[PDB]
Design a protein around this motif. Sequence first.
Motif, PDB file in Angstrom:
ATOM      1  N   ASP A 297      10.324 -39.800 -22.894  1.00 43.11           N
ATOM      2  CA  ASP A 297      10.061 -40.524 -21.655  1.00 43.11           C
ATOM      3  C   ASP A 297       8.736 -40.096 -21.039  1.00 43.11           C
ATOM      4  OD1 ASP A 297      12.408 -41.986 -21.850  1.00 43.11           O
ATOM      5  OD2 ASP A 297      13.579 -40.514 -20.719  1.00 43.11           O
TER       6      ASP A 297
ATOM      7  N   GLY B 161       5.263 -39.780 -20.845  1.00 45.79           N
ATOM      8  CA  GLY B 161       4.143 -40.373 -21.538  1.00 45.79           C
ATOM      9  C   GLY B 161       2.814 -39.731 -21.168  1.00 45.79           C
TER      10      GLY B 161
ATOM     11  N   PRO C 234      -0.960 -38.693  -6.997  1.00 48.26           N
ATOM     12  CA  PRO C 234       0.424 -39.169  -6.891  1.00 48.26           C
ATOM     13  C   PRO C 234       0.729 -40.243  -7.923  1.00 48.26           C
ATOM     14  CG  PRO C 234      -0.638 -39.115  -4.741  1.00 48.26           C
ATOM     15  CD  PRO C 234      -1.718 -38.919  -5.756  1.00 48.26           C
ATOM     16  N   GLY C 235       1.976 -40.255  -8.381  1.00 43.82           N
ATOM     17  CA  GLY C 235       2.391 -41.216  -9.382  1.00 43.82           C
ATOM     18  C   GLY C 235       2.078 -40.831 -10.806  1.00 43.82           C
ATOM     19  N   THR C 236       1.754 -39.567 -11.059  1.00 41.29           N
ATOM     20  CA  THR C 236       1.426 -39.106 -12.400  1.00 41.29           C
ATOM     21  C   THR C 236       2.643 -38.581 -13.155  1.00 41.29           C
ATOM     22  OG1 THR C 236      -0.819 -38.564 -11.678  1.00 41.29           O
ATOM     23  CG2 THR C 236      -0.068 -37.577 -13.711  1.00 41.29           C
ATOM     24  N   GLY C 237       3.833 -38.659 -12.564  1.00 46.10           N
ATOM     25  CA  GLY C 237       5.036 -38.235 -13.252  1.00 46.10           C
ATOM     26  C   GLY C 237       5.357 -36.761 -13.176  1.00 46.10           C
ATOM     27  N   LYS C 238       4.852 -36.050 -12.166  1.00 46.27           N
ATOM     28  CA  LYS C 238       5.149 -34.625 -12.049  1.00 46.27           C
ATOM     29  C   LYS C 238       6.649 -34.382 -11.936  1.00 46.27           C
ATOM     30  CE  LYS C 238       2.290 -34.440  -8.624  1.00 46.27           C
ATOM     31  NZ  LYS C 238       1.545 -35.679  -8.973  1.00 46.27           N
ATOM     32  N   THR C 239       7.323 -35.137 -11.065  1.00 45.77           N
ATOM     33  CA  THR C 239       8.776 -35.029 -10.969  1.00 45.77           C
ATOM     34  C   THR C 239       9.444 -35.415 -12.280  1.00 45.77           C
ATOM     35  OG1 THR C 239       8.578 -35.601  -8.626  1.00 45.77           O
ATOM     36  CG2 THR C 239      10.779 -35.655  -9.604  1.00 45.77           C
ATOM     37  N   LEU C 240       8.929 -36.453 -12.943  1.00 39.22           N
ATOM     38  CA  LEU C 240       9.464 -36.834 -14.244  1.00 39.22           C
ATOM     39  C   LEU C 240       9.295 -35.710 -15.256  1.00 39.22           C
ATOM     40  CD1 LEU C 240      10.877 -39.060 -15.731  1.00 39.22           C
ATOM     41  CD2 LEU C 240       8.656 -40.065 -16.298  1.00 39.22           C
TER      42      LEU C 240
ATOM     43  N   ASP D 163       9.444 -31.375  -4.610  1.00 40.09           N
ATOM     44  CA  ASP D 163       8.558 -32.527  -4.596  1.00 40.09           C
ATOM     45  C   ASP D 163       7.876 -32.653  -3.242  1.00 40.09           C
ATOM     46  OD1 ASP D 163       7.514 -34.947  -5.950  1.00 40.09           O
ATOM     47  OD2 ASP D 163       8.619 -36.004  -4.382  1.00 40.09           O
TER      48      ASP D 163
ATOM     49  N   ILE E  30       1.773 -44.516 -22.237  1.00 31.22           N
ATOM     50  CA  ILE E  30       2.532 -44.869 -21.042  1.00 31.22           C
ATOM     51  C   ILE E  30       2.931 -46.336 -21.085  1.00 31.22           C
ATOM     52  CG2 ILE E  30       2.470 -45.016 -18.539  1.00 31.22           C
ATOM     53  CD1 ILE E  30       0.356 -42.654 -18.743  1.00 31.22           C
TER      54      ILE E  30
ATOM     55  N   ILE F  80       5.832 -46.658 -23.461  1.00 32.81           N
ATOM     56  CA  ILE F  80       7.092 -46.188 -22.892  1.00 32.81           C
ATOM     57  C   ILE F  80       7.602 -47.160 -21.833  1.00 32.81           C
ATOM     58  CG2 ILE F  80       6.129 -44.782 -21.042  1.00 32.81           C
ATOM     59  CD1 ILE F  80       9.056 -43.820 -23.367  1.00 32.81           C
ATOM     60  N   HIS F  81       6.694 -47.742 -21.047  1.00 30.02           N
ATOM     61  CA  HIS F  81       7.063 -48.709 -20.021  1.00 30.02           C
ATOM     62  C   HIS F  81       7.285 -50.108 -20.574  1.00 30.02           C
ATOM     63  CE1 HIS F  81       5.297 -45.911 -16.793  1.00 30.02           C
ATOM     64  NE2 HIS F  81       6.581 -46.057 -16.518  1.00 30.02           N
TER      65      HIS F  81
ATOM     66  N   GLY G 187       0.465 -43.487 -14.234  1.00 32.34           N
ATOM     67  CA  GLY G 187       1.718 -43.909 -14.837  1.00 32.34           C
ATOM     68  C   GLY G 187       2.468 -44.888 -13.955  1.00 32.34           C
ATOM     69  N   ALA G 188       2.506 -44.617 -12.650  1.00 35.80           N
ATOM     70  CA  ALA G 188       3.115 -45.564 -11.726  1.00 35.80           C
ATOM     71  C   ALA G 188       2.350 -46.879 -11.730  1.00 35.80           C
ATOM     72  CB  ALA G 188       3.171 -44.971 -10.319  1.00 35.80           C
TER      73      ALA G 188
HETATM   74  N1  LIG Z   1       3.569 -40.731 -18.321  1.00 36.07           N
HETATM   75  C1  LIG Z   1       4.669 -41.472 -17.725  1.00 36.07           C
HETATM   76  N2  LIG Z   1       5.760 -41.918 -18.527  1.00 36.07           N
HETATM   77  C2  LIG Z   1       6.842 -42.653 -17.922  1.00 36.07           C
HETATM   78  N3  LIG Z   1       6.817 -42.939 -16.483  1.00 36.07           N
HETATM   79  C3  LIG Z   1       5.670 -42.472 -15.645  1.00 36.07           C
HETATM   80  C4  LIG Z   1       4.649 -41.775 -16.225  1.00 36.07           C
HETATM   81  N4  LIG Z   1       3.763 -41.475 -15.286  1.00 36.07           N
HETATM   82  C5  LIG Z   1       4.215 -41.972 -14.122  1.00 36.07           C
HETATM   83  N5  LIG Z   1       5.394 -42.584 -14.346  1.00 36.07           N
HETATM   84  C6  LIG Z   1       6.179 -43.256 -13.286  1.00 36.07           C
HETATM   85  O1  LIG Z   1       5.870 -42.710 -12.139  1.00 36.07           O
HETATM   86  C7  LIG Z   1       7.177 -42.906 -11.218  1.00 36.07           C
HETATM   87  C8  LIG Z   1       7.123 -41.978 -10.014  1.00 36.07           C
HETATM   88  O2  LIG Z   1       6.080 -41.057 -10.160  1.00 36.07           O
HETATM   89  P1  LIG Z   1       6.450 -39.452 -10.114  1.00 36.07           P
HETATM   90  O3  LIG Z   1       7.042 -39.030 -11.436  1.00 36.07           O
HETATM   91  O4  LIG Z   1       7.453 -39.202  -9.014  1.00 36.07           O
HETATM   92  O5  LIG Z   1       5.079 -38.590  -9.805  1.00 36.07           O
HETATM   93  P2  LIG Z   1       4.614 -38.146  -8.286  1.00 36.07           P
HETATM   94  O6  LIG Z   1       5.711 -37.334  -7.641  1.00 36.07           O
HETATM   95  O7  LIG Z   1       3.356 -37.315  -8.365  1.00 36.07           O
HETATM   96  O8  LIG Z   1       4.351 -39.382  -7.460  1.00 36.07           O
HETATM   97  C9  LIG Z   1       8.179 -42.636 -12.008  1.00 36.07           C
HETATM   98  O9  LIG Z   1       9.378 -43.431 -11.598  1.00 36.07           O
HETATM   99  C10 LIG Z   1       7.703 -43.070 -13.415  1.00 36.07           C
HETATM  100  O10 LIG Z   1       8.289 -44.248 -13.751  1.00 36.07           O
END
Ligand SMILES: Nc1ncnc2c1ncn2[C@@H]1O[C@H](COP(=O)(O)OP(=O)(O)O)[C@@H](O)[C@H]1O
Lengths: 125, 576, 192
Positions: B6, B8, B48-54, B105, B181, B184-185, B209-210
């Motif tokens: 998952d 990416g 933000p939106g780079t998938g750190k939580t993921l 987070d 990415i 995967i998406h 990624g977002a």
């Molecule tokens: N490399 C990746 N592979 C799959 N999903 C990603 C990826 N990068 C970002 N996303 C998407 O980003 C969404 C939210 O971003 P997040 O993981 O919370 O990072 P951040 O907390 O920095 O905003 C996730 O629901 C995910 O779908």
Amino acid sequence: KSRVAILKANLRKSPVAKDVDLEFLAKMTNGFSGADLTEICQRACKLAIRESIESEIRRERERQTNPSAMEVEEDDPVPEIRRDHFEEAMRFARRSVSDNDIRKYEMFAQTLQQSRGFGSFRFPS
Amino acid sequence: EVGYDDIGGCRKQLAQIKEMVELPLRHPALFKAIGVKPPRGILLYGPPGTGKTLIARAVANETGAFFFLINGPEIMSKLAGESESNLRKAFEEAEKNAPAIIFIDELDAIAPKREKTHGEVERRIVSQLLTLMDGLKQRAHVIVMAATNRPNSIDPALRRFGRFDREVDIGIPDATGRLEILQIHTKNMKLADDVDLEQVANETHGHVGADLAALCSEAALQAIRKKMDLIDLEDETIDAEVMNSLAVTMDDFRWALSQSNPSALRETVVEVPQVTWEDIGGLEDVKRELQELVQYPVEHPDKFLKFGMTPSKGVLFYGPPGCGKTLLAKAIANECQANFISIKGPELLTMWFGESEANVREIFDKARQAAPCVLFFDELDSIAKARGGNIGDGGGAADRVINQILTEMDGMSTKKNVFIIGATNRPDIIDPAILRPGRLDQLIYIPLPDEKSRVAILKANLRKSPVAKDVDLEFLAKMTNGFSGADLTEICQRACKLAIRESIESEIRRERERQTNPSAMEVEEDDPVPEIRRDHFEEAMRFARRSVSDNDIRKYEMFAQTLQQSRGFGSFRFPS
Amino acid sequence: KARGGNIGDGGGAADRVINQILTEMDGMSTKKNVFIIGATNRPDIIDPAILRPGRLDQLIYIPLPDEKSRVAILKANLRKSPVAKDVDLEFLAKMTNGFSGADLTEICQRACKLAIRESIESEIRRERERQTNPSAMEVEEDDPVPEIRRDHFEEAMRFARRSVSDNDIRKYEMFAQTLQQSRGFGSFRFPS
Ligand SMILES: Nc1ncnc2c1ncn2[C@@H]1O[C@H](COP(=O)(O)OP(=O)(O)O)[C@@H](O)[C@H]1O
Ligand SMILES: Cc1cc(OCc2nnc(SC3CCCC3)n2-c2cccnc2)ccc1-c1ccc(S(C)(=O)=O)cc1
Ligand SMILES: Cc1cc(OCc2nnc(SC3CCCC3)n2-c2cccnc2)ccc1-c1ccc(S(C)(=O)=O)cc1
């Protein structure tokens, strides 16, 4: 075409082999002036003369050691300006006229131009 | 659940995090019999939106550690005096399920104080969080990972030893990662055969990624709007077969890309350049020298250490504009497979006008984090030109931005990986301090491309465009006596423009014929101009121009011979 | 211009606003939709960085309107105003040897102003005429000047002026030929 004509005129007196493609030399000379082409031709002639003098002399120097040693064959080591002489000349090729002063000449020619707006002038019918 | 598949982007910091966390988590019993301190906290920071939580969730799932998520505003939204209870209970619960991973987070909300530290209760929250974080008795194996946009946004005491002692910059995904990415998406929408996700990935520069997920969703919604709406056959649940009949076409993805608005285009890019030595046709002496200076210390560090020589970590390219200095730097970075950071002149001018040179410190820190990297300062002479060059300011060549760059370089070399490359079209006005030892001392001159180099440049520029074999490229390169790389690029672009205009005009007229005189049998003859021909190139060359005059080349030749190796030692022989 | 132009500041052409514009343009192109168009009456003083590739590189020269262009400009300026068919517009456009679009607009505006003043003055007098000598039967003859006539345009053209001198046109011609496509390739032919 003017460069080709200038090259032909400069080399008329000198014996130039037919193998040398003078048109290629003229076209390769992008923006050489007549003086530059004459200089190139003079350098080629000088190179040919130096080679002929050195080769004939060095042959005579060796030949003179033994009296009548080698045959009486009448060899001409270089009897015409060769291609290699023209490459030798082009190695020293120089652009006398810079593009900036050509810019100045075209500038004076524009200033001398008959203004603008009278091209479409026509007497009423 | 979520795993490495998952996650990416293939951005190669997930591997670093794995190497960081397996043994502490994958082999927790090992640390019980060995005296070693594992990573108590890891600070993941990036846009933000780079998938750190993921990434954190995937690591927790793939290692079996109990994942606990402490949302920043979740605790911050709670009433004062009882949020502290929430944080303490979160740590206790994570402690119970050892090993456990506690993810915070949006850490820049719980402890945003950058020594400004407004308010009262937030100071309590930051101090109590500090006590808990430093209160880890090294028992159990709870690892606290936190997410933050930038390292400097959180409280500095959080950055100290034992609280968050190691940081990873996830950063924006690259073209390879953008493509992964997208893959995967795009895995359950039954992507069409025409769409390849490669062209979209290349055109997707600037997305995260977002952003990639949003673009894919927008393309899917466009596909759903274009079809299956005209029929209007809808029920409580759309039929699976009916919905599967649609295929997301390239046009939908193109429209979505047009409607993307990536959420951080401006953010600096740390990416391995795709340029290769093939793009540059020559510079063999320059190519070999660059290979030496950069590649040799790393490929054969042992031999450098044997002779006790420290390789130079700075190179300054000087030459006429448009000769390929930026491309050469990208190629050298690509050969070593090291990250490339480019600081163009506008950035330096912005730092100089704004009187904000601390950005140089941030830039150098970013280059240090992304090692191996080639920090390139493109058109470094911009500030000198801005201040003058013939008369200039009353003061000397020293300026704020160059002084900060010198300070960072002097304080650099510790990293052993960052390599500074400088390009300047005005070597005369460059500050002399830049060329002192320990700085960009290795001066490399990039001359105008030769005939063979010109042929290579033309081929590289015309590789993508359909070029007819009739048009001889060697003849064109040889014809251009002193054209720069930029001039050759302009000639190629003009030829392509002429071909495009001719093709458009011709097919437009041909369509009028069909409309004016409807033919009884439709038989399209295909494209009237399918590839670039000799006449297009002749018309384009008609407008060919030499951007670089011979006088500025003369000045560069002067400076080059202004770095003259004397005139008396050429015959130096030892006495024997 | 604000910083100078002949001597200017001690520094170069770079300035804060142009630098920010360049940074935005360099960071632009991603959108694929925004198109930057720049207009400048002093190309010599414009920063050279603006013209580098990826920036406003396509330089387009807008010359003074021609006779046909002048006719079109006059028609556009006078489309709203009531213009009598008697006044020939092609003759006026041809008469203006080097008038700029602004000059033609000024001529049209002055003609309209003259017509408006004449109409106001005339109807005002005519109203005195009824007030001074109350006529037994009211019969308004309508407007004494219902549309712009030849005399109005002649009086307006009397004040016509050429805002743009020929020396600044000469400088623009210089810059135009300062983007000269060389002088040796005009006959470029491939070898065949
Ligand atoms: N490399 C990746 N592979 C799959 N999903 C990603 C990826 N990068 C970002 N996303 C998407 O980003 C969404 C939210 O971003 P997040 O993981 O919370 O990072 P951040 O907390 O920095 O905003 C996730 O629901 C995910 O779908
Ligand atoms: C052995 C050594 C390696 C080194 O570093 C090597 C290195 N690694 N990654 C990189 S970076 C990456 C590579 C491509 C992009 C950038 N480098 C590096 C170093 C210098 C220049 N370019 C790269 C430094 C200095 C030394 C030494 C030399 C002499 C002595 S003594 C006491 O006289 O016996 C002691 C120590
Ligand atoms: C196909 C394409 C379209 C594009 O964009 C088109 C566009 N749409 N809206 C606009 S804007 C609006 C229009 C009127 C006001 C402004 N534009 C646009 C683009 C450029 C200039 N003016 C408009 C860019 C670049 C490309 C391409 C070219 C070559 C290759 S390859 C790998 O060598 O095979 C890959 C991709």
